[PDB]
Amino acid sequence: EGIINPPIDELLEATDSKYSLVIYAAKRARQINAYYSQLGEGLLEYVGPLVDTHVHEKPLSIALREINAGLLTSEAI
Amino acid sequence: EAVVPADAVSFTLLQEQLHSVLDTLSEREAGVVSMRFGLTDGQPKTLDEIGKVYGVTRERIRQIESKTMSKLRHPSRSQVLRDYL
Amino acid sequence: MTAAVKDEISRLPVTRTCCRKAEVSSILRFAGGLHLVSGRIVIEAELDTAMAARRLKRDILEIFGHSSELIVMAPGGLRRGSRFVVRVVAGGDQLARQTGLVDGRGRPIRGLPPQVVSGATCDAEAAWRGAFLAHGSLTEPGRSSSLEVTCPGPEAALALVGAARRLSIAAKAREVRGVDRVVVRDGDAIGALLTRLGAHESVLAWEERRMRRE
Amino acid sequence: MTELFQELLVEDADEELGWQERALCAQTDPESFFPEKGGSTREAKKVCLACEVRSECLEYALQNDERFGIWGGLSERERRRLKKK
Numbered sequence: 496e497g498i499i500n501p502p503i504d505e506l507l508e509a510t511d512s513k514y515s516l517v518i519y520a521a522k523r524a525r526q527i528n529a530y531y532s533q534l535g536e537g538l539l540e541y542v543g544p545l546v547d548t549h550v551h552e553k554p555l556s557i558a559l560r561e562i563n564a565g566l567l568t569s570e571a572i
Numbered sequence: 573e574a575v576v577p578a579d580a581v582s583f584t585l586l587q588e589q590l591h592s593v594l595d596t597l598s599e600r601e602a603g604v605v606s607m608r609f610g611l612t613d614g615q616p617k618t619l620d621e622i623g624k625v626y627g628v629t630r631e632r633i634r635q636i637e638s639k640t641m642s643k644l645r646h647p648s649r650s651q652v653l654r655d656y657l
Numbered sequence: 658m659t660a661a662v663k664d665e666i667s668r669l670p671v672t673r674t675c676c677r678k679a680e681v682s683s684i685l686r687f688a689g690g691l692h693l694v695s696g697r698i699v700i701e702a703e704l705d706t707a708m709a710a711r712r713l714k715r716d717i718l719e720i721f722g723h724s725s726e727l728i729v730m731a732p733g734g735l736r737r738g739s740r741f742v743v744r745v746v747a748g749g750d751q752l753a754r755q756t757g758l759v760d761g762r763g764r765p766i767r768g769l770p771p772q773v774v775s776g777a778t779c780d781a782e783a784a785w786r787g788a789f790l791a792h793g794s795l796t797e798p799g800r801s802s803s804l805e806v807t808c809p810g811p812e813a814a815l816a817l818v819g820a821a822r823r824l825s826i827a828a829k830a831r832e833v834r835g836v837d838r839v840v841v842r843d844g845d846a847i848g849a850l851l852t853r854l855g856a857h858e859s860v861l862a863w864e865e866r867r868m869r870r871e
Numbered sequence: 872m873t874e875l876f877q878e879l880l881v882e883d884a885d886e887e888l889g890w891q892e893r894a895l896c897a898q899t900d901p902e903s904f905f906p907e908k909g910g911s912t913r914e915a916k917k918v919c920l921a922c923e924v925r926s927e928c929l930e931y932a933l934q935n936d937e938r939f940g941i942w943g944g945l946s947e948r949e950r951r952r953l954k955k956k
């Protein structure tokens with residue numbers, strides 16, 4: 496439990512390599528943090544989290560959990 | 573003479589907190605205080621300049637400012653601003 | 658009479674953190690207390706509403722980081738009014754010191770915490786909402802509702818009056834038989850106040866009732 | 872009841888800035904202490920009556936000589952006559 500979870504192999508099964516997984520998780524974490532920061536305002540922008548979280552959980556851990564659960568998609572622009 | 577980030581953030585927080593204390597005051601009080609001390613623009617205008625907007629007399633501008641200072645300099649709104657001094 | 662009103666207020670979503678803190682502090686001050694037992698301070702808050710107790714417990718756990726029990730046994734003993742009591746024993750001193758009930762390593766604060774006062778209008782209306790949820794009534798015996806909410810000591814009542822003033826809403830403190838409350842009589846202020854608190858359907862129902870009867 | 876055994880014996884602050892922090896009116900509407908128009912000066916007088924630092928507030932107000940509001944449970948002319956006596 497902690498940095499060890501979720502297992503890296505399960506995550507890599509959902510992406511191409513480590514280099515893409517880093518960017519994918521980081522972008523989702525930035526989205527979650529941006530949603531949290533401007534929650535006081537009544538705003539419709541950014542979404543999540545899509546899983547049950549704790550009182551104060553790092554957004555990167557939540558992003559990795561959603562990625563493992565398979566609730567996200569990645570496209571190429 | 574190097575910008576210490578802690579000091580800069582402290583000054584920014586002071587600037588943001590000062591406006592809120594003025595917010596609870598009446599419209600005229602906050603307006604005249606801001607114009608006299610130039611918080612919004614940085615140019616401290618004269619009493620006649622302040623009274624021109626509201627049309628009140630010079631002496632009125634003198635008194636209205638004093639009541640605001642008495643209000644802020646009270647044991648009821650000083651606590652929010654005591655630390656920053 | 659007031660059950661639907663309090664249900665609607667409890668069901669209202671809230672986002673801003675400061676307003677949640679103010680609401681928690683208000684409810685704890687009004688319908689809550691502290692006990693020094695076994696050498697430790699325990700916080701007990703008694704509510705007579707279904708969703709309000711859950712909302713208070715969730716707010717405590719989320720912002721203040723504490724656990725509660727949410728017992729349903731009636732301190733009154735009747736067990737018919739569902740006198741919910743929410744308890745905080747672990748870290749009770751920290752919760753009391755960091756929620757405004759006790760400060761300065763001294764006596765409990767009679768009035769509302771200074772943080773709630775001298776805040777934004779949103780926090781003032783949130784404090785009034787919490788006060789109404791904790792204790793209060795909507796009587797409508799005769800011509801006016803008499804939206805009275807009782808407070809412990811003159812300080813809390815007059816602080817509530819002051820908070821209501823910042824909303825441009827008329828209010829009056831009163832004392833009778835040694836117990837004091839804050840009331841607003843005229844219908845317009847009642848309607849505006851209830852609208853500001855967030856209730857909508859109850860506000861309408863009251864509006865049509867008053868217009869048809871009066 | 873919930874008296875905490877008169878502040879109990881659990882305290883970690885062990886630090887006080889001054890007698891401002893012990894002001895009761897800080898827990899109370901500032902506006903009621905500055906009666907505008909005609910106003911009234913009895914409810915806030917009652918509030919001050921229970922203040923634990925009333926003497927310090929009165930002394931500081933007299934020394935700085937504020938001519939507005941109600942301090943130490945007294946209004947402007949009570950302060951004026953005390954100063955003149």
Ligand code: SF4
Pocket residue numbers: 647894895896897918919922923924925928929941942943944
């Ligand atoms: S005596 Fe002074 S400090 Fe005490 S409540 Fe009155 S105005 Fe405030």
